[PDB]
C-alpha cells in the first residue's frame, strides 16, 4: 500500500482483524524512530496513561500538550501534568464562542528525522480499546542539511499547509515546531491537509479552511466524470451539531455543495450519512458506555428530525469492526455501485457548522469556531483517475482500504439515532446494563 492509512487495535476481535492495525504503543515504539521530543495535539488527555504509552527510555523526553481547555478544566489538566517536569502545555486560543480544539495530531522529532501522525483518538485508555479509529502515518521525513537551500515541499503543498495551520495558533511553543518542520524534507507527502481554525475568513483567506478548503482542492485536483450526478456522497461521524430547521439551511446548500465539487467547470446527488443507531451502541463491545463518546444531545436532535432520514447504520464486517463503535470521521465520494471512490478524507471534523464552517455576511465570509485537521487522498496525487475500493480491509497501489461496509444500510423503521442524554431501559447491553444518564 502507498496510503499509510491504519485502524487502531480493537481488544476482543480475532487476531486476523488486528494484524495490520496500530496501537499507540506501536506508534511511539523505538522501531519508528529514536524520540527526541514530541507534540500531542488533542481534545482529552489522561496524562498518567499517556506517559506510560511512551517507551520507558523515552518517558523523560520533552512533550508538548496542545489543548483548548479553559478555567477549571485548564487547571485540572495543569494538575495532571505537574508531576511530569518534561511536560509543557499550550492553550489554543478559542476566541469564538462554543468552539473546541478537536485536532488530533502527533509531531514526533527523532534523531533520524521527523514524523507527523494525524489521527482520530483522544489520549485516554477507552479511545484505543474497543473503538474504530483512524490513523495516517507520514513517511520518516529526513533533515535538510546545514547550508543546503531546498524547499522540502511536496506536490500537495503539505509542508506549507502544515506550517500555515500551526501559524494560526500564534503560539511560541508551536513556532519552535514550525522551525523544526522548516528544517525537514516533506517532499514525499502524497496527501493534502485540510484544516479548520477559528475565525472569520473572507477574500483570499476564504479558501484556506473548512469546507471551502475541501471545495478548492476538489476543483483544482479532481476531474469531473460523466454521470457525476449519480456518484453519491458519504459522511461518517461520531457527533452531530445543530444544522438548522431543514436541509436547505446548511446541509444540502453549502456543505453538500462543497462535497460534490469535482473539477473546474460548473442536486440529485444522493447523500448517505453513517451514524450509530441505538441498537448499534447497545450490542457493541463496550455496550451503552460507548455512547458516552457519541455526543448528540436530545436538545439538538429534537430540532432536526428531518435529518435522521439520511442516517445509515454503522456496519464494518470488512474490518471485523461492526461492534467497535466509530470515533473515526470520514467523508468520501463513491461511484454509483460503490466499487470506486473519487476521493477519501479522514478527519477530526464531525457533522457540524462549528467544524466545517458556515457562510456569513451574504455569502462573503466563512465563520469557523473550532480547530480540526484531516488528510485528503486524491487519485491524481497517486497517478490514478480513481481508487478501487478494497474488498476486505485486511486482506494494491490503486486499492483503497475503506474501513466500513458499502453500500451503507439505511435505518430500519424501529431504529433511532444514538442520543446520549436520554435513558435506554428497554433492553440491556453486552455487559448486562441499562443506560440512565
Ligand atoms: O469527536 C467527537 O466526537 C467529540 C465530540 C465532542 C467533544 N467535546 C464536547 C463535549 C463533551 C464530549 C464528551 C464528554 C464530555 C463533553 N461536549 C461538547 C459541547 N459542545 C462542543 C463540544 N463538546 C469532543 C469530541 C472529540 O473527540 O474531539
User: What single string gives the DSSP state of each residue in 30-43?
Assistant: GGG--EEEEEEE-S
Kindly tell me the burial class for residue 150, based on how many C-beta atoms sit within 10 Å of its own C-beta (0-12, 13-18, 19 or more): exposed
DSSP one-letter code for 306? G
- Dihedral angle at the C-alpha atoms of 178, 211, 123, 98, nearest 10 degrees? 100
- The angle subtended at Cα 42 by Cα 59 and Cα 353, nearest 5°, is 175
Backbone break loci in the chain, preceding residues, C–N > 2.5 A: 266, 395
Three-class SS of residue 323? coil
Q: Is 420 in the pocket of ligand 1 (CB under 6 A)?
A: no
Q: Is 329 annotated as a binding residue?
A: yes
End-to-end CA distance of the chain: 44
Distance 423 CA to ligand 1 centre (A): 19
User: How long is the chain?
Assistant: 437
CB 435 within 8 Å of CB 425: yes
User: Which region holds residue 436: left if phi is over 0, alpha if psi is between -120 and 50, else beta?
Assistant: beta
For cell 488533542, what's the residue? 42
Catalytic residue among 101, 211, 221, 327: 327
Cβ-proximal residues to 71 (8 Å cutoff; 6+ apart), any chain: none
Cell of 258: 462543497
Cell of 343: 476521493
PDB resolution in Å = 1.9
Catalytic residue among 67, 102, 221, 312: 102
CB 163 within 8 Å of CB 180: no
Torsion angles phi and psi, residue 272, rounded to 5: -105, 120
CA distance 166 to 290: 32
Q: Is 435 in the pocket of ligand 1 (CB under 6 A)?
A: no
Tell me the domain boundaries of the chain: 1-190, 191-437
The structure was resolved experimentally with X-ray
- The angle subtended at Cα 260 by Cα 254 and Cα 265, nearest 5°, is 100
Alpha-helical regions (H) of 222-347: 256-259, 278-282, 298-301
Q: Contacts from 217-220 at CB under 8 Å and sequence distance 24+?
A: 217/192, 217/376, 217/378, 218/258, 218/261, 218/262, 218/263, 218/343, 219/261, 219/262, 219/263, 219/264, 220/264
Helices and strands per DSSP (H, E), number in the chain: 10, 21
Nearest to 213 by CA among 237, 243, 193: 193
CB 30 within 8 Å of CB 56: no
Is the alpha carbon torsion for 9, 10, 15, 17 positive or negative? Answer: negative
Q: Is 340 annotated as a binding residue?
A: no
Nearest to 190 by CA among 376, 418, 433, 422: 376
Cell of 352: 457540524
Three-class SS of residue 290? helix
Amino acid at each position: 500500500n502507498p496510503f499509510q492509512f491504519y485502524l487502531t487495535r480493537v481488544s476482543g476481535v480475532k487476531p486476523k482483524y488486528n494484524s495490520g492495525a496500530l496501537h499507540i504503543k506501536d506508534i511511539l515504539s523505538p522501531l519508528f524512530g529514536t524520540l527526541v521530543s514530541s507534540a500531542q495535539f488533542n481534545y482529552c488527555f489522561d496524562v498518567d496513561w499517556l506517559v506510560k504509552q511512551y517507551p520507558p527510555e523515552f518517558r523523560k523526553k520533552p512533550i508538548l500538550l496542545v489543548h483548548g481547555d479553559k478555567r477549571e478544566a485548564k487547571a485540572h489538566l495543569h494538575a495532571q501534568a505537574k508531576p511530569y517536569e518534561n511536560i509543557s502545555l499550550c492553550q489554543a486560543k478559542l476566541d469564538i464562542a462554543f468552539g473546541t480544539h478537536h485536532t488530533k495530531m502527533m509531531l514526533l522529532l527523532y534523531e533520524e528525522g521527523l514524523r507527523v501522525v494525524i489521527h482520530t483518538s483522544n489520549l485516554i485508555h477507552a479511545d484505543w480499546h474497543q473503538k474504530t479509529q483512524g490513523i495516517w502515518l507520514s513517511p520518516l521525513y529526513p533533515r535538510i542539511a546545514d547550508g543546503t537551500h531546498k524547499s522540502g515541499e511536496s506536490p500537495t503543498h503539505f509542508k506549507a499547509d502544515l506550517i500555515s495551520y500551526l501559524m494560526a495558533y500564534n503560539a511560541p511553543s508551536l513556532k519552535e515546531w514550525i522551525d523544526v518542520i522548516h528544517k525537514h524534507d516533506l517532499s514525499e507527502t502524497n496527501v493534502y491537509l485540510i484544516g479548520s481554525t477559528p475565525g472569520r475568513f473572507q477574500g483570499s483567506q476564504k479558501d484556506n479552511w473548512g469546507h471551502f478548503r475541501l471545495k478548492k482542492l476538489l476543483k483544482d485536483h479532481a476531474s469531473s466524470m460523466p454521470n457525476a450526478e449519480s456518484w453519491p456522497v458519504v459522511g461518517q461521524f461520531s457527533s452531530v451539531g445543530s444544522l438548522g430547521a431543514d436541509e436547505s439551511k446548511w446541509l444540502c446548500s453549502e456543505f453538500k455543495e462543497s462535497m460534490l465539487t469535482l473539477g473546474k467547470e460548473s442536486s440529485s446527488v444522493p447523500l448517505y450519512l453513517i451514524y450509530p443507531s441505538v441498537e448499534n451502541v447497545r450490542t457493541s463491545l463496550e455496550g451503552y458506555p460507548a455512547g458516552g463518546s457519541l455526543p448528540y444531545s436530545i436538545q439538538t436532535a429534537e430540532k432536526q428530525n428531518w435529518l435522521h432520514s439520511y442516517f445509515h447504520k454503522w456496519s464494518a464486517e470488512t474490518s471485523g469492526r461492526s461492534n467497535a463503535m466509530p470515533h473515526i470521521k470520514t467523508y468520501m465520494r463513491p461511484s454509483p455501485d460503490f466499487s470506486k471512490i473519487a476521493w477519501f478524507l479522514v478527519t477530526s471534523a464531525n457533522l457540524s457548522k462549528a467544524a466545517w464552517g458556515a457562510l456569513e455576511k451574504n455569502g462573503t465570509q466563512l465563520m469557523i469556531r473550532s480547530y480540526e485537521l484531516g488528510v485528503l487522498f486524491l487519485p491524481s496525487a497517486f497517478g490514478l483517475d480513481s481508487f478501487k475500493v478494497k474488498q476486505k480491509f485486511f486482506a494494491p497501489m490503486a486499492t483503497f482500504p475503506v474501513p466500513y461496509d458499502l453500500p451503507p444500510e439505511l435505518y430500519g423503521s424501529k431504529d433511532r439515532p444514538w442520543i446520549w442524554n436520554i435513558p435506554y431501559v428497554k433492553a440491556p447491553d453486552t455487559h448486562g446494563n441499562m443506560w440512565v444518564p
